[PDB]
Design a protein around this nucleic acid. Structure first.
Ligand SMILES: [Mg+2]
Ligand SMILES: [Mg+2]
Ligand SMILES: [Mg+2]
Lengths: 52, 59, 148, 114
RNA sequence: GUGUAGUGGCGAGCGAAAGCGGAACAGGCCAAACUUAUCAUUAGAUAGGGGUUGUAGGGCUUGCAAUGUGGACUUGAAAACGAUAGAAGAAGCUGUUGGAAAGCAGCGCGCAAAAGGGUGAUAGCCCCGUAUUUGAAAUUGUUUUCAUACCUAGCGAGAUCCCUGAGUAGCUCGGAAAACGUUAUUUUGAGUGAAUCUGCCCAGACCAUUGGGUAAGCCUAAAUACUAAUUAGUGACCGAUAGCGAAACAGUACCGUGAGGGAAAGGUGAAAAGAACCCAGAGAUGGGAGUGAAAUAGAUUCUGAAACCAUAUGCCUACAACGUGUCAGAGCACAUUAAUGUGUGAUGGCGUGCGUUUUGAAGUAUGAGCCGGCGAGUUAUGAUAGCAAGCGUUAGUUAACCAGGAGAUGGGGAGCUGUAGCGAAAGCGAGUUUUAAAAGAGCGUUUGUUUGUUAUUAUAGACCCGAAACGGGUUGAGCUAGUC
RNA sequence: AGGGGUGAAAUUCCAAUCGAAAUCCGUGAUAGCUGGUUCUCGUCGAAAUAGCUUUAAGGCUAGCGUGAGAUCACAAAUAAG
RNA sequence: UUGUGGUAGACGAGCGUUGUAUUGGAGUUGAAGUCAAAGCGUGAGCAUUGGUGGAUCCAAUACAAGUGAGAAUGCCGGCA
RNA sequence: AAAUCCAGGUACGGGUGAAGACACCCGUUAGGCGCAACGGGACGGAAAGACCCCGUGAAGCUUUACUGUAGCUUAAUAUUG
């Protein structure tokens, strides 16, 4: 999950079927609970707290 | 559904069910009915439980 | 919820399959009975019908409509039984829209109503008040202003 | 999706056919007749499961009366001499089988003469 | 808004216009006066300038201020992005099973390229491609810029001056469109027929007041409907009785004089390496041989079930009244999903099918010759009730639409249900209707909403199939009837 | 050339079919009338009556079944008085 | 302890099919489809081995239905 | 070839039965299987009875049934002095 949607990472990881990068507002319940492993980035914690 | 046009003009729907209705036998002939009948039929009443279901789903 | 296994608490009810053998019930007849009119396709005759006999709604005389072709002029009503729960003074249009009791895109006369006692004084400018509603709101040492 | 369902029908009719073997004619070939024959055979089995315990009792009665008539008394008299006095709970299958190994059932018929 | 106001043998039914929230947004141009020119100028006609209307405007006289912004707009020139062909385009060996490795195992590598297809069995690294970067001699599309036509331009004072769409608006008699079944509004077949800014029309008969708008002339892109066609792609779409009727030389074969009707059918193999040669037979062909991993893959060509037909191991059957089985039951022959085993059954007791519809069917009621396949309670939008979930006491909740990978979802509070009801209604209000009555009686003095699922129901063909018919359009006097 | 034609008239003929051709369309016409409607087990389990009906082979309500909930005692059955 | 027949019918609990999404797994040492057999369940059903066949398939949880066939003088095909 | 056919290994008398039995109950007779015959029966086959009745079915026809209408006729009105 990401906020700025960097292009170096998005350009990478495209051919890797397991991984996927999504914006903070692009993730759904299924797209999250299916991961079984995720890497939240630093700031979206505050935004998620605000949105609750 | 389209509400039955010939129903909403005879059945004022009151609070908490209990569809109200006028009484019949009040439009044509006066002398054949006594004053007791005449001054009872002017008041209005509800619909019995038999036809209540068939009228409620019609409205 | 471990998508490999997800469950609800209780929502899966018996589905009445109509043409699926006598073992489950609902055999050849699918629950239509036996050889009636309902049993035939497109049965279940018109909702208001009593088999030729004059139906109930046709017997009774019609309610009249004195004011014919007109819509009863609607009123927005403040019942004092609940306005106390709405903590606010100087009740008016400029405030009720903030509390979302009414909407900005609405030019409608405001009416006051109710018999319940109220503790803290309030202030209204509305178009109509009930007699004893006015008495009650005045007894609370409030006030009311009558807009035409 | 569209469903054809070939395996299930074949398996079901195969089971019904297999239930009936040794049947005459086409009864063991056509499922439509095999199912009816299986129904009738099972009805007959249900009836005979009671008929056989209804009948073996009579068979024991007969093969006991035949033995008793060789000693000088009838079956009806025998039960009283069992029930009313010299009380016993000897079943009619063994009070009949014991004759097949004699010199021990004669002990029964003489004991009741007391 | 809403199944609302209303319309309806007030029956079946039918169903707005406002208002609100959104998609889109551009308004211009003639006739008429006035005037120029030309018409035997009897113009009553033609071609110019002027004017295009409601906080009425335009013309007439006299001034002021402007040289512009804009087009639903002409020519070229320039730029840009495309469309119609393409080019480059990474990375692997060994071993084993095997006919074949790409499988699996061991050790590596590439990735802006783990889409796909092929390659002797399932390959990110064998090949074509893919991501990505680039490519137009010629035709052609769209947008932008420049100049360039054509059109387009504001504000004063005077003055009973003139113009503002005539067989027109209305009105009568018949019809119709509007949700209206003839009703204000609109329309017209016949007739009749005005007014001119102090005007005319309109605010569901009609009149007055108030207010709104200026008909009887014309044009106008965007939101809109559709996909036979082209390109790319997708599918909890079909997979050879399915899917278009048509996977194949299908509207063909075939039927009908004609309109018209209208099918069935696919798969060897890895690659023909399609079986040289020998025997039999006239030959087809079969048996060998050979190729092949496999010839019980051989052209009848993947898999090969049942109905049906044959042949055989074991048991029984030619004094027998049999819906054919069942419970007992020897004898005989074997050995299994090891099981108080299997196969057959001399003989005993008992024994009138399956579905339909019926008060009652073995029925001398009805349907099925058998086998295989296909074959009938669904969906859209609503309402009701049950169960469960979310949010909850000024609650709950979005619709269309926009953004988002033809996603969840965010924005969108327009509305909807509840919060107060009673009354035909004005109205009143925890009361209200009736009533002279505050008596009495009736109704009320609180339980929610949005969903998911189930059941029922309404309009849709609404479980399946089955009529004789009805109405419209076409083809048929080659047979037959009449006539020439 | 078809709610037409033809008829020394019979309801004859109009492509083997005519009390009104054949074919296509509205069309999946309607059918209170037949027949059909497919997997299993468990619990409960009737009616063929009343009234009305251009109703009598049908329908509505009531009667009888079933599921959920309430009333347990004053309700309902069973004997005796 | 009371029971456990049952048509119309009312309610509950389940089996099976094809596909989808998550995990897991098997497969030229032979998957599915097919036949055979003296297997196992209360029932829809589910295994085990062998022959054939040669490339996909199975298990667990949910979702979705063109989802279950003996009858319609049913259609089609084949054979009596 | 053909229509037909629920599966058949398909006796007679008395009685019973949905009211006339190859299959039922009680008796009697009958070795297995053909071929040529002849039609008593299998309420034998073909034809969802053509008679009769029901359907708030169809079509055709009739009339002083109802509602309309083509046509014919009369008047007013425009063409119309
Ligand atoms: Mg059935
Ligand atoms: Mg039936
Ligand atoms: Mg006959």
């Amino acid at each position: 999950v990401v906020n700025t949607l960097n292009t170096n990472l998005e350009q990478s990881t495209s051919n890797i079927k397991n991984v996927q990068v999504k914006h903070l507002d692009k993730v759904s319940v299924r797209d999250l609970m299916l991961a079984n492993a995720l890497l939240v980035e630093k700031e979206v914690l505050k935004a998620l707290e605000g949105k609750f | 559904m389209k509400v039955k046009s010939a129903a909403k003009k005879r059945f004022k729907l009151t609070k908490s069910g209990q569809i109200k209705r006028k009484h019949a036998y009040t439009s044509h002939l006066a002398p054949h009915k006594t004053t007791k009948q005449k001054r009872h039929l002017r008041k209005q009443g509800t619909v019995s439980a038999s036809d209540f279901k068939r009228i409620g789903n019609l409205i | 919820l471990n998508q490999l296994k997800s469950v609800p608490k209780a929502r899966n009810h018996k589905t009445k399959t109509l043409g699926r053998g006598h073992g489950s019930g609902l055999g050849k007849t699918s629950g239509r009975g036996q050889k009636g009119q309902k049993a035939r396709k497109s049965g279940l005759t018109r909702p208001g019908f009593e088999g030729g006999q004059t139906p109930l709604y046709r017997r009774l005389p019609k309610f009249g409509n004195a004011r014919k072709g007109f819509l009863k002029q609607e009123w927005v009503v403040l019942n004092l039984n609940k306005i106390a729960k709405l903590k606010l003074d100087k009740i008016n249009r400029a405030s009720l829209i903030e509390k979302q009791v009414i909407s900005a895109k609405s030019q409608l006369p405001i009416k006051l109503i109710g018999h319940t006692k109220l503790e803290k004084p309030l202030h209204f400018e509305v178009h109509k008040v009930s007699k004893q509603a006015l008495k009650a709101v005045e007894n609370a040492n409030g006030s009311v202003k009558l807009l035409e | 999706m569209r469903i054809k369902g070939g395996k299930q029908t074949r398996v079901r009719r195969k089971k019904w056919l297999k239930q009936a073997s040794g049947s005459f004619g086409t009864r063991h070939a056509s499922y439509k007749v095999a199912k009816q024959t299986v129904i009738q055979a099972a009805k007959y089995a249900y009836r005979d499961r009671r008929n056989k315990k209804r009948d073996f009792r009579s068979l024991w009665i007969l093969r006991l009366n035949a033995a008793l008539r060789e000693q000088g008394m009838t079956y009806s008299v025998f039960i009283n001499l069992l029930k009313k006095h010299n009380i016993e709970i000897n079943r009619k299958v063994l009070s009949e089988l014991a004759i097949k190994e004699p010199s021990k059932f004669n002990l029964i018929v003489q004991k009741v003469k007391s």
